[PDB]
């Protein structure tokens, strides 16, 4: 199947409390493999997946200073964007950056992306074609003009369809044992009377990987969005994920509601029904 590499960065100004907190995290698919935390004792890019630990001290020496550079850029940008938005020097603000690339089963480039946010809102993003930028508002258009000047899009394209796609392809082999696996969802339903005449049907999916999944409830074959409680997909903490969906039903009609589970490791869509005798 398809694979991805992604880096997430967060920079949080702490006015009068020293430099901004800086936390970086790298993933392959839904598996974390590196991290950097400005407040952590190490002050180095640390490994976080077994198969990346073999990388030599040159790898960790590079990554440490590069990820620190990105941190210093976010340190200036916090001040610049403060000006663009005419904000005081007393408030805490947040820059967030996400970038990476996607490949197919054969290791060929599919997609590159970069997106930036300020205080949790869209700021500027690189377009799908990797040539042009979309700024979210008029302040971010100032940056878009700076970056169109200095041809950042072309230097960045270098990484997103070049360096990125090659190192993804290495990692995917250094860790071929753990990363190529797909675990399909163990499924089952539960039933909880809320009273004498209504009950909660809860459709569970556990132990799956990757985290993408779909749960849907059908009443006589029709999709009920009524009384449908869906939780966020969550990590088991072992590399797998969990999700559930629930619908409140009239007691004695449990047979007419059916739950549907779609996942990549599933040869056909699972269909589950509460089976009263």
């Amino acid at each position: 199947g398809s694979h991805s590499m992604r880096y997430f960065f967060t920079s949080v100004s702490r006015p009068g409390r020293g430099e901004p907190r800086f936390i970086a995290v790298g993933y392959v698919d839904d598996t974390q493999f590196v991290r950097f935390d400005s407040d952590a004792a190490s002050q180095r890019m640390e490994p976080r997946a077994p198969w990346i630990e073999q990388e030599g001290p040159e790898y960790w020496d590079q990554e440490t200073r590069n990820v620190k550079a990105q941190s210093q850029t976010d340190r200036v940008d916090l001040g610049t964007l403060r000006g663009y938005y005419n904000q005081s020097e007393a408030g805490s603000h947040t820059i967030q950056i996400m970038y990476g690339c996607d490949v197919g089963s054969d290791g060929r480039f599919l997609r590159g992306y970069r997106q930036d946010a300020y205080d949790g809102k869209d700021y500027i993003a690189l377009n799908e074609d990797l040539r042009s930028w979309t700024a979210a508002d008029m302040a971010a258009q100032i940056t878009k003009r700076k970056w169109e000047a200095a041809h950042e899009a072309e230097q960045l394209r270098a990484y997103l369809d070049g360096t990125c796609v090659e190192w993804l392809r290495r990692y995917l082999e250094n860790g071929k044992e753990t990363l190529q696996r797909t675990d399909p969802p163990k499924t089952h339903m539960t039933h909880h009377p809320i009273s004498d005449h209504e009950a909660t049907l809860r459709c569970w999916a556990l132990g799956f990987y990757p985290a993408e999944i779909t749960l849907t409830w059908q009443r006589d074959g029709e999709d009920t969005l009524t009384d449908t409680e869906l939780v966020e997909t969550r990590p088991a903490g072992d590399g797998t994920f969990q999700k559930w969906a629930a619908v409140v039903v009239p007691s004695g009609e449990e047979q007419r509601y059916t739950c549907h589970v779609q996942h990549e490791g599933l040869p056909k869509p699972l269909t589950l029904r509460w089976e009263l005798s």
Binding site: F8, R48, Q96, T190, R234
Partner: protein, 99 residues
């Protein structure tokens, strides 16, 4: 520019008393990233609690996994306690086995 955490309390594996397991508190959907999370055992703060590195979603909201090894019993109560700017008082979420 502020979102309140969504809080989920659950076990890594299905709970069976007497057998080692993991207690999970997943807080997602919040902004800003300043947040406080404690796991509670009969209302008392559990001390050896680890967490994931801060990351975030397509919509830019943050998520974190706090966890600790525990052995469920019948009598013991487990909860998650989260404090965030969006919250006037720390929210406490009790561990329910079927959630």
């Amino acid at each position: 520019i502020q979102r309140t955490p969504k809080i989920q309390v659950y076990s890594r594996h299905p709970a069976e008393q007497g057998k080692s397991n993991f207690l999970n508190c997943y807080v997602s959907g919040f902004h800003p990233s300043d947040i406080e999370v404690d796991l509670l055992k009969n209302g008392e703060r559990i001390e050896k609690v680890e967490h994931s590195d801060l990351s975030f979603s397509k919509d830019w909201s943050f998520y974190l996994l706090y966890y600790t090894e525990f052995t469920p019993t019948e009598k013991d109560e487990y909860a998650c306690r989260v404090n965030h700017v969006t919250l006037s008082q720390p929210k406490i979420v009790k561990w329910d086995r079927d959630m």
